[PDB]
Amino acid sequence: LSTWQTFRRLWPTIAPFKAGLIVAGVALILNAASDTFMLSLLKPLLDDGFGKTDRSVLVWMPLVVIGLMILRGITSYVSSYCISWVSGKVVMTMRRRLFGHMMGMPVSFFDKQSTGTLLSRITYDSEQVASSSSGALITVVREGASIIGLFIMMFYYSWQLSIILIVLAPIVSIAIRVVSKRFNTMGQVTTSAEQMLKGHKEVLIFGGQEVETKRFDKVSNRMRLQGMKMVSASSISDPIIQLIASLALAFVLYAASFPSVMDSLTAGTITVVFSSMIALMRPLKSLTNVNAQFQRGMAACQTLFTILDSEQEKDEGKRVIERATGDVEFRNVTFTYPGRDVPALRNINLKIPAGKTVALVGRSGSGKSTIASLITRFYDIDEGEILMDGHDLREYTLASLRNQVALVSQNVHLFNDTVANNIAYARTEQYSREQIEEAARMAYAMDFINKMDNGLDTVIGENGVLLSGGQRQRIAIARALLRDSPILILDEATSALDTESERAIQAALDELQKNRTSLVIAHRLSTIEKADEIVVVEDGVIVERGTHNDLLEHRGVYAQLHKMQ
Amino acid sequence: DKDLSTWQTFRRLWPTIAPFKAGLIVAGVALILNAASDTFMLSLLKPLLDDGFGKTDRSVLVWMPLVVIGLMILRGITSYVSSYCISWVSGKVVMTMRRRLFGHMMGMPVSFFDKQSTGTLLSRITYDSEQVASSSSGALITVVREGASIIGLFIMMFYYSWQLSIILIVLAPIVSIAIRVVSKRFRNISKNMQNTMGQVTTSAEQMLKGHKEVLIFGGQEVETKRFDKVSNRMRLQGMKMVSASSISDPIIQLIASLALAFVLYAASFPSVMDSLTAGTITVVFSSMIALMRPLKSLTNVNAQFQRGMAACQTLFTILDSEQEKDEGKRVIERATGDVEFRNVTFTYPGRDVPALRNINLKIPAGKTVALVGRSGSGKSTIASLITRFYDIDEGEILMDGHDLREYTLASLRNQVALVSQNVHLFNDTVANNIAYARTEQYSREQIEEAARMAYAMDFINKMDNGLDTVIGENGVLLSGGQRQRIAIARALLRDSPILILDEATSALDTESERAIQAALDELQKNRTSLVIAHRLSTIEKADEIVVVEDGVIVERGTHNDLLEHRGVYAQLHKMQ
Ligand SMILES: *O[C@H]1O[C@H](CO)[C@@H](O)[C@H](OC(=O)C[C@H](O)CCCCCCCCCCC)[C@H]1NC(=O)C[C@H](O)CCCCCCCCCCC
Ligand SMILES: C[C@H](Oc1ccc2ncc(/C=C/C(=O)O)c(C3CC3)c2c1)c1c(Cl)cccc1C1CC1
Ligand SMILES: C[C@H](Oc1ccc2ncc(/C=C/C(=O)O)c(C3CC3)c2c1)c1c(Cl)cccc1C1CC1
């Protein structure tokens, strides 16, 4: 029921190209016939060819075989080009549909699943569905035409032998069933090696090389034993299946011996009746496995309809702000991550007056990073109110709201393009290269850019292979600087502070934070002390706050928190 | 070039394979007998047509069905055997390669690991070593099985109708050249799509991973329009991929179809058809047809074999990489712990600013020293150097009056205990984590007291199975404040003479830190200590405090003396 209902959810995507499937379909039909017409000629070559008629061996055969193969070769080229064309069109339509849909999903959708899983949905599953269905379509028709093309030729040239094979087919069918039914370690290998490379530091001291080598020996030998097992199982099945089929066909030949049968048979008749019986062994093998591949094709497809049926983040705000030099205010905000029942943030009131930088410090796991995630509306809240310019964040459209925020973090993912186009990301045409180039030196990122071979027009290549942890940060700063966003969110938990030129990064932040609202998950001592207000978060609550005469002494946790970092 | 680069690389791998040569020898004999079953069955067509239909019922009846059944049994056995033998030889060689790679990576420099992602090494050794066997195995099976059958078929063609065979042979070279040219023209474009698919991968991965900056910076169109382009080129290249073989396959068998028709156009002419009979033509032509698949498989062996050696080389380069330099030749059992830096300067690999310069400091046995200074300096670097993770550039680091590099890394590193919050917790029992590599040397009562003296038993006694609970699974079960106490339990048990204590990454925000402070006190009563200090407790009791900035020791003294002095140290006291 499901297996076929999914395909019918999929057919609409295919229907614009059905024009390619039928043309392929006929190309398949004529291919089976051409292969059937050559087993046909096998009788005139033997009987007529050696019934004292060199007429047939010179005329009939050498030129009809070349004729049939041209037809055979063109039908193959055509069906191949149609299926491939249709198969290409649907995978593209689907990859594109999932790319757009997944991109519009909320961050809750990305938390559950791996990024590679969602990427597998686009790269492989989308291709496996058309692969499994195309082959399904080919086998149903191509070998469905051959099987009837061959069965006719069988009975016509000798009804006696054919009906002896058919009566045996039920028993053979049941026999191939019982044997085809008799048709973790890899995870341990990857783990045993990964946690070795993880603890290489701890393996050198304590001298664990020995216990690690023999831990691996076990794990590597166990997967080798599982590896041989699967092939061994697979190996034996077909030899038996061939044996079974050979028995029945042998019995059919012991039948041709009887004088009533042999008299009807010539040298050619039997040669084609057994050549066509043998030609039936591949179509039968294909036609029995075809619904198993259609299943796996549609199971991968309902996976993607599960994704496509998922709902994109809700953007019902109908309010637009050109630019907001203004404060962000939390009004008794309480938040709980979906799937968790203990609020990450309890009753919280926080004010970030315009132009001022509020550095919030907190324990590594606390909901300090949850605060900067709520302002950008990665998640909607359960109770309370967050006001930007005295109006709820949910009042605004999400595009306008996020135009006011700029994110800066080491882990800011850098996309595959020029340095310059990363800095002017999604606004390349807006900013002149002079505007770009200035933002680069104002971020102290130029010190390493000119070292690059083409400098600013050098392209970050192969998924970001060239840049270092510290380098990305100064490009993230240049991106926010150039865009000049009213609200600055600065992630310093992921910063990787120990760098070759940290003083360069620090002054950049100095320039960026200035005359600009800034909300920083701070780990650095310098960005902390030269910040307008400090805010401590303990679990879901704010324990104590303080300015500059309060920075001298805090009532709550600051003394122990500062002492640790 | 590549037939040489592959063949010299193969002669590198044969040492790994030769211990299983017996498996190869057997597999091949079966493959031989496998190809003869197919050759001997096509011969059965001649007596069937000539005698069985030359008015004799014995041939078709009694034995003809028996023999074919027998031949199939032989085919099935030769099949299964060769398959099992190859799958056995491969499994071994694969496993062996892994143990060689694994063993070699464990002994690599620390620079090799901080620089390379852990994954890329892990993926290659599991994937490549399997490809080296798959490609090599398939190559062997072809040269033997199909190389045997072409012989078997060539002979049978010459016995039955010595004449027809030669016409095929004289046609062979031009048919061969005809086929090779057609083949080289079209089908060699797998990489063209690999590039295009890579761009589908990159764009999709960039969008999915960097999903949060796309939303903030509003690059949905720039990402969409980019995936619209690349996905189409991927689509197009997929078709150019099939069109390669959709065009090349029908052309090639047409070329071979001509050559056979000309052999069949001679079958009509009188000189040779007279001697021959209807039963010999069937076995001669079917043999020529049976020759087509073997000839296809063989001429594609180099492509298969060279590919396998192209992945075996990537495993050989990693093996050729230089391992940790280790020429000490000196072994020390329970060093005293008299560590002294003399004129040490050092720059991390690839950087151009030394992490340390003209460092001179002395750490006498049984006494602690605290290294405090601006975060991001080389105090961490100092700790790294005593374990030989990195060799200094200039100067010398002495352990009991001898340069560390004089010592065996094994002996040198058994002297050093490391305590920090970022210790690795191997997924295994708590007891076996406390006695990591010495489960055989330390009794249970020995392990029990080490955890007790580390003040860790409160959170161990709360475990599911207590001390035999399995911590690990990459460490979820243990908090940071609890990692230290396990790290401390390791050091108490082994009782190493030189302690490296890192509170930098440690968390003083722990419900039980007075218990962590008591464990630390008991730990360092005995031995030399080198603290990257960040706690009031340790700098309070430390024997010497050295202030480090920019890889230079600018002030050395006791906590009180430096406060009487009240210079740079007092500034830090005011700052923290
Ligand atoms: O698709 C190819 O690979 C698969 C994987 O094994 C093969 O099964 C497949 O072969 C079959 O599909 C062939 C089919 O089972 C039998 C029908 C084709 C014709 C068989 C011979 C007829 C005798 C004609 C006498 C006049 C593979 N495709 C090849 O095997 C295709 C096959 O070789 C067709 C090309 C044959 C060339 C014809 C030359 C005739 C010369 C006559 C002189 C006596
Ligand atoms: C007597 C025999 O009747 C079956 C019936 C069902 C089968 N269903 C599947 C398979 C193969 C399965 C596989 O390869 O997994 C076979 C054998 C022909 C291979 C089957 C043979 C047979 C042979 Cl022998 C050769 C040609 C035709 C038939 C029957 C008339 C259909
Ligand atoms: C006359 C003709 O001589 C070649 C020579 C080299 C070949 N080398 C490769 C291939 C196939 C390549 C592929 O499929 O990519 C073929 C065709 C017979 C298949 C080749 C045919 C021929 C045919 Cl016709 C049939 C059987 C034997 C031969 C040769 C005389 C031994």
Ligand 1 atom nearest the C-alpha of B285 is 44
Among A131, A145, A136, A160, which residue's Cα sits nearest to residue A257?
A160
Please, where in chain B does CATH 1.20.1560.10 lie? Answer: 1-320
Are B461 and B508 in contact by the 8 Å Cβ rule? The answer is no
Specify the residue for token string 């589908």: B200
Distance CA B57, CA A187 (A): 62
> Chain B interface, mutation test: which of A98, A99, A125, A281, most B Cβ atoms within 10 Å?
A99
Strand partners of residue B498 = B416, B528
> B62 near B3, Cβ under 8 Å?
no
**Integer Cα distance of A378 and B91 in angstroms:** 49
Instruction: Locate CATH 3.40.50.300 in chain B.
Output: 339-575
Which residue, among A511, A533, A508, has the nearest Cα to A520 in the 3D structure? A533
Provide the 10 A C-beta neighbour count for residue B464: 8
Say if CB B210 and CB A415 are below 8 A apart: yes
The answer to whether B72 contacts A403, with C-beta atoms less than 8 Å apart, is no
Rounded Cα–Cα distance for residues B514 and B440 (Å): 33
User: Quick count: other Cβ atoms within 10 Å of Cβ A47?
Assistant: 17
CB B62 within 8 A of CB A253: no
What is the residue with the minimal CA distance to atom 1 of ligand 3?
A: B172
Q: Does residue B345 sit in helix, strand or coil?
A: strand
Name the token pair of A335: 């938040």
Q: Residues near ligand 1 with C-beta < 6 Å?
A: A 35, 38-39, 41-42, 45, 65, 279, 282; B 253, 257, 260, 264, 285, 289, 292
Instruction: Tell me how far the alpha carbon of residue B253 lies from the centroid of ligand 1, in angstroms.
Output: 10
Distances (CA, A) of A160 to A37, A143, B48, B387: 22, 24, 18, 87
Instruction: Tell me: is residue B5 an annotated ligand-binding position.
Output: no
B38 contacts B149 by C-beta, under 8 angstroms: yes
| Helix then strand then coil, % of chain A, to nearest 5 | 65, 10, 25
SS (H, E, C) B92-151: HHHHHHHHHHHHHHHCCCCHHHHHCCHHHHHHHHHHHHHHHHHHHHHHHHHHHHHHHHHH
Encoded tokens for B502: 């890192």
Q: Where in chain A is the domain with CATH 3.40.50.300?
A: 328-564
Tell whether ligand 2 has an atom less than 6 A from the beta carbon of residue A245: yes
Please state, in angstroms and rounded to a whole number, the distance separating the CA atoms of residues B340 and B398: 5
Please work out, in degrees rounded to the nearest 5, the angle formed at the alpha carbon of residue B90 by the alpha carbons of B85 and B93. Answer: 130
B414 and chain A in contact, CB less than 8 A? yes
Using DSSP's 3-state secondary structure scheme, residue A315 falls into coil
Check: CB of residue A333 under 8 Å from CB of residue A381: yes
| DSSP per-residue letters across A87-99 | HHHHHHHHHHHHH
Name A407's bridge partners.
A489
Task: Enter the tokens of residue B245.
Answer: 């073989």
List of residues 6+ apart from B446 with CB closer than 8 A: B493
Q: How far is CA B264 from CA A69, B186, B529, in A?
A: 15, 30, 93
Binding residues of A for ATP: 362-369
Q: How many residues does chain B have?
A: 576
- Protein residue with least CA distance to atom 14, ligand 1: A279
**Nearest in space to B537 (alpha carbons), one of B564, B572, B513:** B513
**What are the start-end ranges of the H helices in A366-452?**
368-375, 398-403, 419-423, 433-441, 446-449
Q: Are B151 and B34 in contact (CB under 8 A)?
A: no
**Site to substitute for ligand 2 among A277, A281, A288, most atoms within 8 A of C-beta:** A281
Token couple for A297:
């094709």
Are A348 and A333 within 8 A, CB to CB?
yes
Nearest Cα to Cα of residue B107 among B410, B432, B435, B428: B410
Q: Strands, DSSP E only, in B249-381? A: 339-346, 356-363, 368-373
Q: What is the DSSP string of B180-200?
A: HHHHHHHS--HHHHHHHHHHH
Query: From ligand 1's centre to the CA of B137, what distance in Å?
Result: 27
**Count of C-beta atoms within a 10 Å radius of residue A387:** 16
Interface of A with B in 65-84 (CB under 8 A): 65-66, 69-70, 72-74, 76-77, 80-81, 84
* Residue that has been written with the tokens 């999709």 in this structure: B204
Which of 3.40.47.10, 3.40.50.300, 1.20.1560.10, 1.10.260.40 would CATH assign to domain B1-320?
1.20.1560.10
Rounded CA gap, A334 and B427, in Å?
Answer: 37
Q: What is the C-alpha separation between B258 and B255, in angstroms, rounded?
A: 5
Task: Output the DSSP codes for B12-39.
Answer: HHHHHHGGGHHHHHHHHHHHHHHHHHHH
Contacts of A220 in chain B (CB under 8 A): 95, 98-99, 102
Beta strands in A436-553 (DSSP E): 487-491, 517-521, 533-538, 541-546
C-alpha A320/C-alpha A395 separation (Å) is 9
Half-sphere exposure at residue A499, Cβ-oriented, CA atoms within 13 angstroms: 18
Q: Residue A276 contacts by C-beta under 8 Å, 6 or more apart in sequence?
A: A36, A39, A150, A153, A154
CATH class assigned to B339-575 = alpha beta
Name the DSSP letter for residue A555: S
Cα dihedral B448, B451, B452, B455 in deg (nearest 10): -170
Phi then psi for A218, rounded to 5 degrees?
A: -55, -55
- Provide the residue type at B231 as one letter: S
Decide whether any atom of ligand 3 lies within 6 Å of the B259 Cβ: yes
Give the pairing of strands B428-429 and B470-471: antiparallel
Protein fold of A1-309: ABC transporter transmembrane region fold (1.20.1560)
Cα B341–Cα B346–Cα B350 angle in degrees, nearest 5 = 160
8 A C-beta contact, residue A56 and residue A47: no
Within 8 A by CB and 6+ apart from B253, the residues are A69, A73, B292
> β-strands A533-538, A357-362: how paired?
parallel
Expressed in Å, this structure's resolution amounts to: 2.9
Closest among B501, B492, B496 to B539, alpha carbons compared: B501
List CB contacts (< 8 A) between B79 and chain A: 235, 238-239
**Could you tell me if B222 lies within 8 Å of chain A, comparing CB atoms?**
yes
Which residues, listed in sequence order, are joined to residue A534 by a DSSP beta bridge?
A359, A546
Element (H, E) at B284: helix B278-290
Residue B216: how many CA atoms within 13 Å on its side-chain side?
A: 27
Interchain proximity A235–B83, CB inside 8 Å: yes
Contacts of A139 (CB under 8 A, 6+ apart): A286, A287, A290
CA B427 to chain centre: 21
The 3-state DSSP class for residue A452 equals coil
C-alpha–C-alpha distance, residues A435 and A456, integer Å: 13
* C-alpha B488: how far from chain center: 33
What is the C-alpha separation between B534 and B511, in angstroms, rounded? 17
Any CB–CB contact under 8 A between A463 and chain B?
yes
- Under 8 Å between Cβ of A467 and A460: yes
- Interface residue of B161, B215, B404 to substitute, partner A, most A CBs within 10 Å: B215
The kind and range of the H/E element at A328 are strand A328-335
Altogether, the residues listed in chain A come to a count of: 565
Report the alpha-carbon distance of residue B426 to residue A192 in Å, rounded: 10
Pocket of ligand 2 contains residue A285 by CB under 6 Å? yes
DSSP A312: P
For A536, the token pair is 């401590």
User: B466 to chain A nearest CA, in Å?
Assistant: 24
Query: Residue B463 Cα, ligand 2 centroid: separation in angstroms?
Result: 60
For chain A, the straight-line distance linking the first and the last C-alpha, in angstroms and rounded, comes to 60
Q: Which residue spans within B426-519 are E strands per DSSP?
A: 428-429, 470-471, 498-502
Q: A446: which residues sit within 8 A by CB, 6+ positions away?
A: A440
CB atoms within 10 A of CB A332: 11
Task: Give CATH 1.20.1560.10 domain extents, chain A.
Answer: 1-309
Contact criterion met (CB below 8 Å) for B273 and A54: yes
Which residue intervals of A44-114 are DSSP H helices?
A: 54-55, 61-103, 107-112
Encode burial over B72-102: b for 16+ CB neighbours within 10 A, e otherwise. bebbbebbbbbbbbbbbbbbbbbbbbbbbbb
Phi/psi at A127 (nearest 5 deg)?
-85, -30
Which residues in chain B touch residue A539, judged by CB atoms under 8 angstroms apart? none
CA distance B515 to A189: 39
Please list the residues that pair with B544 across neighbouring strands.
Answer: B369
- The values of phi and psi at residue B365, to 5°, are -65, 145
- Check if the beta carbon of residue B434 is closer than 8 Å to that of residue B472: no
CA dist., res. A161 & res. A157, Å (int): 9
What would you report as the CA-atom Rg of chain B, rounded to the nearest whole angstrom? 37
Tell me how many degrees the CA angle A345-A350-A351 measures, rounded to the nearest 5.
155
The amino acid at B321: S
Residue with tokens 């002494």: A553
Q: Where are the alpha helices (DSSP H) in B415-479?
A: 430-434, 444-453, 457-460
Question: What CA–CA distance (Å, rounded) separates B353 from A501?
Answer: 10
Which ligand gives the minimal distance to the CA of A173? 2
For residue B247, what are its two tokens? 């065009």
What are the structure tokens assigned to A561, written together? Answer: 């928190």
Handedness of CA B385, B391, B396, B402 (dihedral sign): positive
How many other CB atoms are found less than 10 A from the CB of residue B371? 25
B473 contacts on A by Cβ (under 8 Å) = none
Q: What is the DSSP string of B370-412?
A: EEEESTTSSHHHHHHHHTTSS--SEEEEEESSSBGGGB-HHHH
Tell if the CB–CB gap between A213 and B474 is shorter than 8 Å: no
Cβ contact B415:B335 at 8 Å = yes
In whole angstroms, give the CA distance from residue A147 to residue A284.
8
CB B347 within 8 A of CB B111: no
- The two three-digit tokens of residue A323, written as one number: 């630019």
Per CATH, the architecture of A328-564 is what?
3-Layer(aba) Sandwich (3.40)
Q: Tokens for B250?
A: 């029908």
- Alpha-carbon gap: A370 to the closest alpha carbon of chain B (Å): 14
